[PDB]
């Protein structure tokens, strides 16, 4: 049967989040980007709410909690996108929200299309690996815990205990299906290498975000208030490499 912590993770998953996209009039790049930003503002709230129910997290110093969220928001959102796209449309469209699903036709702008192809590697890997919901839920928590400041965290001990606990839980998740030590271990390698590889992908999304943000008035792209602050607070420092990404492999 399903381990308790995984059952809890399932129960604290956010409910479906709508973009609120005006689905009548057609896409310009800038209107589509505004909708994505509006959706991202709703997803950020939902990430912050989720984190308050996530076992272990609230017990870290409040500054660590804020930092871990500001560092991981993009990863969490690309990972969420991959899962939904995998689950709902067999990884063959980008399922941002039920009212915002993008197929190839709706990605005109080449820079944005390039970005979408990059994000698309995640749903493709989920399909290839056949990631279970149980593995995903533990992987997601490890993403929240996958980048820390160069100095480390105020609650460094508690943080490392928490990360360890979700790594064991992922190994439990893997065991639900993957029987046998060699298959289990190869599977662990694969899923944690996927997490390692997300740092690279996410760096491209970070740069595109800060660019679009600085140029927002020239592009007519709207950035809501909470998103604007996470970007202003941390994105230049993150892009400048002034953070320590955690890696499962050398
Ligand atoms: C929402 C959502 N779901 O997955 C992703 C990725 C998002 C998302 C994440 C971040 C942002 C911030 N603005 S943005 O740079 O213009 C951007 C990024 C980064 N990705 N996308 C799809 C956009 Cl628009 C907007 C949407």
Q: Three-class SS of residue 248?
A: coil
**Residue 84 annotated as part of some ligand binding site:** yes
What are the structural domain ranges in the chain?
1-250
Domain formed by 1-250, architecture = Orthogonal Bundle (1.10)
Q: Kindly give the distance from the C-alpha atom of residue 225 to the centroid of ligand 1, in angstroms, as a whole number.
A: 15
Pocket test for ligand 1, best of 209, 217, 228 (most atoms within 8 A of CB): 209
- Residue 7 structure tokens: 């059952």
Q: How far apart are CA 119 and CA 4, in angstroms?
A: 32
Tell me the technique behind this structure.
X-ray
Find, among 186, 213, 158, 192, the residue nearest to 33 by Cα: 213
CA distances from 102 to 123, 206, 231 (A): 13, 20, 25
Pocket test for ligand 1, best of 16, 32, 40, 85 (most atoms within 8 A of CB): 40
Q: Residue 137, Cα to own-chain centre: how many angstroms?
A: 11
Residue 206 CB-half CA count within 13 A: 23
């Amino acid at each position: 049967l399903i381990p308790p912590l995984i059952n809890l993770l399932m129960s604290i998953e956010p409910d479906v989040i709508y973009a609120g996209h005006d689905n009548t009039k057609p896409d310009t790049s800038s209107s589509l980007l505004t909708s994505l930003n509006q959706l991202g503002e709703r997803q950020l709230l939902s990430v912050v709410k989720w984190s308050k129910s996530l076992p272990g997290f609230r017990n870290l110093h409040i500054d660590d909690q804020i930092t871990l969220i500001q560092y991981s928001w993009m990863s969490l959102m690309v990972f969420g996108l991959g899962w939904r796209s995998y689950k709902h449309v067999s990884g063959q469209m980008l399922y941002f929200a039920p009212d915002l699903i993008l197929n190839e036709q709706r990605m005109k702008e080449s820079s944005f299309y390039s970005l979408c192809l990059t994000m698309w590697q995640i749903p493709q890997e989920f399909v290839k690996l056949q990631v279970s919901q149980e593995e995903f839920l533990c992987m997601k928590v490890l993403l929240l815990l996958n980048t820390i400041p160069l100095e480390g965290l105020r609650s460094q001990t508690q943080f490392e205990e928490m990360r360890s606990s979700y790594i064991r839980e992922l190994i439990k998740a893997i065991g639900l299906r993957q029987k046998g030590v060699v298959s289990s271990s190869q599977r662990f390698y694969q899923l944690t290498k996927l997490l390692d590889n997300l740092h690279d992908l996410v760096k491209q999304l970070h740069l595109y975000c800060l660019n679009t943000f600085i140029q927002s008035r020239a592009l007519s792209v709207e950035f809501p208030e909470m998103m604007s602050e996470v970007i202003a607070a941390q994105l230049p420092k993150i892009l400048a490499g002034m953070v320590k990404p955690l890696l499962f492999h050398k």
